[PDB]
From a paper:
However, these antibodies work by blocking binding between the human ACE2 cellular receptor and the receptor binding domain ([name]) of Spike (S), which is one of the most rapidly changing virus:host interfaces. The bicyclic peptides described here are structurally and chemically unique, comprising cyclized linear peptides with a symmetric, central small-molecule scaffold that forms covalent thioether bonds with three cysteines encoded in the linear peptide sequence. Rapid screening of diverse bacteriophage libraries against [name]-[name]-2 Spike yielded unique Bicycle binders across the entire protein. Amongst the different epitope groups, only E2 Bicycles were capable of directly competing for hACE2 binding (E2 IC50 of 520 nM).
Author numbering:
A (entry chain B): 1 to 17
B (entry chain A): 336 to 528
């Protein structure tokens, strides 16, 4: 559902906040 | 007793947009791994000789480390252009140190893809040498401002590599270590044995 970097991966890498 | 060994042997490596820097100072340098240059796929020294580093003394030594594709290692050199040199990790023209890389497909690739390694796909301009950018600001791809909202023409700036073990060697993950030997106007703290 997320382009470029999947949402779960964005959370895992600390990219959501 | 400099921790050069731990830079190479670190279990985790950084994504290239968030390249890790380790400052080395006030220690005795063990340059043994640099003598084993035949074991690395890339080993290019600019203004340095591993067999002469024992005789030299430095104020600081920075060890930058990250994962990129093998076909991108050529960009970790002076005077290069491309997605990595431009938006992720830039070496200067006057660079002095070594660029060391090795294939890490066995560790960093996963079946289905390892999406945990990223690179910056979008940026308003190129990086200056040694500039680091870890912002996740939404990228304005159209003429209309995004106001930080991700969507139509407003893109997440970073991209997953999705490393797979069956991809060709040029698309496989390589771990890179860049050593910058700095001798500034200060007392030398990194000396040989
Ligand atoms: C693709 C964008 C998206 O679905 N969401 C925005 N967002 C993040 O980007 C977190 C880094 C919050 N969302 C989620 O956490 C669910 C995937 C929603």
């Amino acid at each position: 559902a997320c382009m470029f970097v999947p949402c779960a991966v964005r959370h895992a890498l600390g990219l959501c906040a | 007793l400099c921790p050069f060994g731990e830079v190479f042997n670190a279990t985790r490596f950084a994504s290239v947009y968030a390249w890790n820097r380790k400052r080395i100072s006030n220690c005795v340098a063990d340059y043994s791994v640099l003598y084993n240059s035949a074991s690395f796929s890339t080993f290019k020294c600019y203004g340095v000789s591993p067999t002469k580093l024992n005789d030299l003394c430095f104020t600081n030594v920075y060890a930058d480390s990250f994962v990129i594709r093998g076909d991108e290692v050529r960009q970790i050199a002076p005077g290069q252009t491309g997605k990595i040199a431009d938006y992720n990790y830039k070496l200067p023209d006057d660079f002095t140190g070594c660029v060391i890389a090795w294939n890490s497909n066995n560790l960093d690739s996963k079946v289905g893809g390892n999406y945990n390694y990223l690179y910056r796909l979008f940026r308003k301009s190129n990086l200056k040498p040694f500039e680091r950018d870890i912002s996740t600001e939404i990228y304005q791809a159209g003429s209309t401002p995004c106001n930080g909202v991700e969507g139509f023409n407003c893109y997440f700036p970073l991209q997953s590599y999705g490393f797979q073990p069956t991809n060709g060697v040029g698309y496989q993950p390589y771990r890179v270590v860049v050593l910058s030997f700095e001798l500034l106007h200060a007392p030398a703290t990194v000396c040989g044995p």
